Each structure stands twice: as structure tokens, then as C-alpha cells.
Design a protein around this ligand. Sequence first.
Ligand SMILES: [Mn+2]
Ligand SMILES: [Mn+2]
Ligand SMILES: [Mn+2]
Ligand SMILES: [Mn+2]
Length: 150
Amino acid sequence: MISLIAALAVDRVILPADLAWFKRNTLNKPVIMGRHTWESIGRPLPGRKNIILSSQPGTDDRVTWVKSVDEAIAACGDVPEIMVIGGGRVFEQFLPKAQKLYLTHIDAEVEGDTHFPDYEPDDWESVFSEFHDADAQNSHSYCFEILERR
Ligand SMILES: [Mn+2]
Ligand SMILES: [Mn+2]
Ligand SMILES: [Mn+2]
Ligand SMILES: [Mn+2]
């Protein structure tokens, strides 16, 4: 089953507490990302099969390069759950096939260009929500949400 995971600020623009959330829900799962996202981490996410979706030939043999959504899905094989970690245009392509959304709602206004897709709230069931206030380590309030396609 295909899952999307992302941290969303004001206007769905894409807090150390999110890193443990991301790491826990992606460990030992294949991760599908865009090229811009791949250029950001610089090296593959440890303990996870890294798949990059790009129309251009690959330039790093440490990860798995694919040129379409269906090729990215096939590259994962038969696994319990596939995680898509962005960015925005990659999220848009995998949203119609996604059955789970791992959203971290961060009450923060940041300057951004890219946004998480405008998913239809009517089509998603909130199966998990966990609200946290800001503290000495997290400068904003944040809510860990998991939604399942209806
Ligand atoms: Mn080769
Ligand atoms: Mn805030
Ligand atoms: Mn303002
Ligand atoms: Mn409190």
C-alpha cells in the first residue's frame, strides 16, 4: 500500500519532533522522492531503499532511478508499505494511488514555494491524531495525523 508522508506548515507549505516521527514511519520501508529532494539529503536515507523519480538518467548508483510512477511502484516489489516523501509535484503524482497520509501539521508560517497537494478531505478518514504544544525544543505546536483513504 502506497503512503505519503510530509510536514505541512501554513498553506500546506512543505520542529525536531518531526524527525523522530519521519524516521519511525519510514524505517525499513522503500522511500520514493523527487530529484530536487534527492539533491537535498545528499546521501541515501540509511536503512531504506531510496528510489528517485526523474525523467533524466540517473547520476548516482547508490539509489534506484526510475522515470515513471508505475516504474517506481514496481521497483519496490511486494512490500507491506511504500513511503513517498516528496516533493510537491511527486506527491501530486502518487496521491491518486495513495491509501495513507502521514501529515505533521505545524502551526508555522514559513516562506515556501512548494505545497502539499490539495487533497480532498471528504475522501480521507482521520484514523490517528496526536496534538503537541510548543516547548523548549519545538518552537511551534504540531499535530501528528494519519489519514486513510475512504
Ligand atoms: Mn551502471
Ligand atoms: Mn507557530
Ligand atoms: Mn504575517
Ligand atoms: Mn500543553
